[PDB]
Symmetry: D2
Subunit: 384 residues, 4 copies
């Protein structure tokens, strides 16, 4: 048994899920990763094939088209998919979170209207929280939703929205009441609604397979029936979405790191310099040992958090933050060391390691930056 075996500890059902996801990634994603990244293509066709396997609504209830899997099942799947394309898998995760928010907090009409098409990916979703003036301080958002009759009139702008322009469903966090978290509500806005526009496609370091652009609302009238949950429940929904988001983005980092470790091990054994394989150099052997050891530690952390969350444990929220902090930091380092191990080749787009580095790098900033993770964790520990 490999010392970095990703299947150890999983039950038979999960090992199957893992195999299916990995096979899909190797066949449909890995061969196209470089192209999607270079051309900044949103892989609609491949994502829809992924949805046919049940990855469009991984942890969404089956009555609305979901696969109804657990947090751990989901982590295992995203980790495997991330070895194919971390950027694309990360977007799939965001899409899933949007569907989960509607599925978990919406009424029956909302669930059967929005979730089915998201699960088949007939339609794609984007999560709209961040604004130019509200990033880490998410609860200070300014986008307003003024209630008038049977509609909410939205005014404001969201920033860095993944999938914007391509998505048909937008889960928007807006302010319906006073200042602070309590005045925020969650409202679904559909592509095509008058008053909804988009900014330019942003050029980024990575996560290129998913379009990034501002989402703008100018006196945008939206049906009150589109509000998910009651007024003032918006930040609660956002905070609960973050627990799973932290586990899942960390799972994407795990996949990139695992792929990087495998590529590195094979490269050291094959590439020769000074008449011997690079693997003959003790310094490189030790670096690889560190990479493998920390990968195993990161995997244990992410899966431990996933189990804690699905079991509804009181330490789950803190564990999700610790796992996200630890895994995104350690996994980026692993990918970056793997790049170093490839030498000049690691800097070329023809080699996957550099994209795992570029894509995993941003995970340290999203779903609550790692600085924010430390604020949350320390607060929790010092309060006890």
């Amino acid at each position: 048994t490999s010392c970095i075996d990703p299947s150890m500890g999983l039950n038979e059902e999960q090992k199957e899920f893992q195999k299916v996801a990995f096979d899909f990634a190797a066949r449909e994603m890995a061969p196209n990763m470089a192209e999607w990244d270079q051309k900044e293509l949103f892989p609609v066709d491949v994502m829809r094939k992924a949805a046919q396997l049940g990855f469009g609504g991984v942890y969404i209830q089956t009555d609305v088209g979901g696969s109804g899997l657990s947090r751990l099942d989901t982590s295992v799947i995203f980790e495997a998919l991330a070895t194919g394309c971390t950027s694309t898998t990360a977007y799939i995760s965001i899409h899933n979170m949007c569907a989960w928010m509607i599925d978990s907090f919406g009424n029956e009409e909302q669930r059967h209207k929005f979730c089915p098409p998201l699960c088949t990916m007939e339609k794609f979703a984007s999560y709209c929280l961040t604004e130019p003036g509200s990033g880490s301080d998410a609860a200070s958002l300014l986008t307003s939703a003024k209630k008038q009759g049977d509609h909410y009139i939205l005014n404001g702008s969201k920033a860095f929205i993944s999938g914007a322009g391509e998505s048909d469903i937008y889960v928007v966090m807006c302010r319906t009441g006073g200042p602070g978290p309590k005045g925020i509500s969650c409202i679904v806005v559909e592509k095509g609604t008058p008053g909804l526009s988009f900014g330019k496609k942003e050029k980024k370091v990575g996560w290129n397979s998913q379009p990034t652009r501002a989402v703008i609302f100018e006196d945008c009238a939206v049906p009150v029936a589109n509000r998910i949950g009651s007024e003032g429940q918006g930040f609660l929904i956002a905070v609960r979405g973050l627990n799973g988001g932290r586990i899942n983005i960390a799972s994407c980092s795990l996949g990139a790191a695992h792929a990087s470790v495998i590529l590195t091990r094979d490269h050291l054994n094959v590439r020769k310099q000074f008449g011997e394989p690079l693997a003959s150099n003790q310094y490189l052997q030790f670096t690889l040992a560190d990479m493998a050891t920390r990968l195993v530690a990161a995997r244990l952390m992410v899966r431990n958090a996933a189990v804690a969350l699905q079991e509804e444990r009181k330490d789950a929220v803190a564990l999700c933050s610790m796992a996200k902090l630890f895994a995104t930091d350690e996994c980026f380092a692993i990918c970056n060391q793997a790049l170093q191990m490839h030498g000049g080749y690691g800097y070329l787009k023809d080699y996957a390691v550099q994209q795992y580095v570029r894509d995993s790098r941003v995970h340290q900033i999203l779903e609550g930056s790692n600085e924010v993770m430390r604020i949350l964790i320390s607060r929790s520990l010092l309060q006890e």
Copy 2:
């Protein structure tokens, strides 16, 4: 539920073991730690009290006086005891390993003769492997055991032996055959045997509660009936002992680190500078967050390895090495950060943090130094 709760995930029986060990540590060890360290006292009376609770032969079979507990049970117990005195707990672990080697590889006569007195700690044991010329390269040991009639004549010297002088039973690795790993045998030598002498009591940075002396053999005749296992089985016995040794020393590191995190959290909340608790300083909050996150990661790694070992999994040996490498490195860093958090007070012997630092520091060198751990881990991964 605390984000660093050490009981999470354990079964009911284990939570009880943990409670007993912790209470014993808080009552009998913690109040005396500083004194044992300052006066370099081998705490015979307290260790015997520990044995009364079943800590003298934690994972030794019950038929010979042991407690018959598992690898995970043992890790939990040593982690809890180490919060009281890491040095003393580490020695208890070494003593336990010696008893385990006899229990696991000895014949019935040897098991019932040596194990019972070790389990009650009527007698103490020392493991003798290292020599001046063989440390990391342990299989190159020179101490010879020449068969002569019904006795082996031993000649050579062992170095850094914990408990030497105080121990009545010495598990000695000697060369009965040719060069290399295959010519080593394990033989029990009892205090009082003519030809056995000890070097001076070495002064050290930590682990002061356990005497460190060279063990010298000069034409020391030992009964062939004292050989544990068959001739040439020594290497195997030492290697099997190392798997548990790595888990247990890492467990001692976990205890030191956990104690340090708790002391730090409380200190930050109580000590005031600039008119506010130290905890009000964000840099200190973030450092504590890092400490806690890595403690949880280290704990998962150690317990994961313990479970793999007791389940006899094919990845157990590699995992024990990874766990020892990760935990001893991360835990020392945690204790050292805790020292920094106490300011000048952390440098004073009146504050426990500095001994957790001094004691845990040597764990990165023992049971196979962390450099050796990387050799073993990289070798395994590169051959896959």
Copy 3:
């Protein structure tokens, strides 16, 4: 300022620094993002830089050079790197090529190749690496067989910066036996039959410089183009790298300095939680670390530059230490600066991400940092 890049410099060097920085801010910084996005080799701007004397910074004045010292050169490249690290790094490579010819060539060669390089009428590329010889540079296979007054070259070089655009290629080839002693340095000119280039490589950074394989198929080159004696090639190559490494490290310094300044200003203007980001102690402390490591890296590079110029016996080791320390520390500084910008740091609209992408490769090329440790340890353990 505690990160004042002029401290310790003489009046002349402070003037060089000012000219270099002003040029970078006016001609490079405004175009950095575009050159990177479109992968454009800024010929016109580089020629403007050559007009200021940056085409042959440490080349002798009799052949068009500026005749400046290694320290003067470090100061200049550090300043230019704040505008575009990728482009400045190439200028450094071009300069190294000119220096090898200027320092080891005969008068005819010096006056033939150096003048056009100093005005950048022509550009140069350094060709050492091959598919099978990277860190183990002395194992190169490109052969050069003598035939009359020409050498017939056969082989291929990899990762060549400026390939295709350059007119002068300083090529390390094997004229004799195996190892370092059988290598010679030969100048190959663009347009020579038998010389071709591979595809334009796609990379993470250093996009303003084309990167292509250089292929030789029965390429006939004049024996008169050989710099130095046969078998002196590897010695010339490494001698060139000691200075090249100091200069690549200087480019890292520039990227890091720019990143620290950008971060400082960003923390003071960007507000979250009703206060500037600078009000958060962790960010204040992190900036303190960045500045402290930047000053340490600057001292290391300048210290090595002085040792190299004075030709001290500890110069080779110091250049290696400086390259190792500065490229590692500066990448970390730039990466932290990116974190400090949040999501904005990941956007191509913000310079910090290019300083990260460009400085990252400095830990690999011009002799990887693992190779640096080889050089340093050998020196330490032998004494």
Copy 4:
């Protein structure tokens, strides 16, 4: 020339100072370091021999018995002396700082009365700032000095005072006015003064050759004529003194690290395991390269700061803080790595490396903790 040659860049005069200092350390300090540490002995006779060479008042004006050397000359001397005993050299530096404060800010009567005896070390000095409730927040000290006729009546206590009990001259920062820095004054208190007492001799991890005791004042009458500077100038004098003290403590760290690197280099070449010198292992080779590289960087930082301070540049305060921060952190890491390179031997008191580790560790805390250094540095950066 070695790549870590400590004489490179120094003028002829400084190379001679360095040689004298190193030879003295090798002959009078190195051979006794272990004993002074084990027995906690204040080496009065040896320190007086050092003063005979001009090390009692290295940067004190010559008109009062000083050597009148520059900050850079001083750094070179302390770095060299620290290779013999870091603990003792650190105290010599503190003594020097006290003498400098009197020399630089006192009136001619005080300068000629106190400085001469200090320069020959006929008398020893202690710096008294820290109190139980004021460490990093030094300006919040509580020790009061109430004027009564031509005497000040002192009440309060100081903590962690190096040399307390042995010193004849105590430079005490006390509160003569209102709250904060502006109400602090500097006053010299002589041993034997009624009302002055000392606490127990503190047990510590390192700096054992220095007695550490609390200094207590109970209605202690001290001449107003003993006040250095004007009332309210005390804190300014304290910090001006610390700028130089910080450069010197960092210099002591350089010496500990340099000695550790040399010891490691020789050890790797002589000690053999697996049939070859330890130096044959690439990981150890690379680690030594890192140690040497960081040592050179730290040396440049400290000497750079010394030059800035001597030239009274506007960036001197920030540079001194950066040098102390960088050097104390890097040097402790170097010494700790050196300990690892010695294996178990590095943990024994018979090997010098462990004391360089124990002694250099506290440099990251005292003379202004490294967290405080970051406060000073960030303030400067964000203000400009």
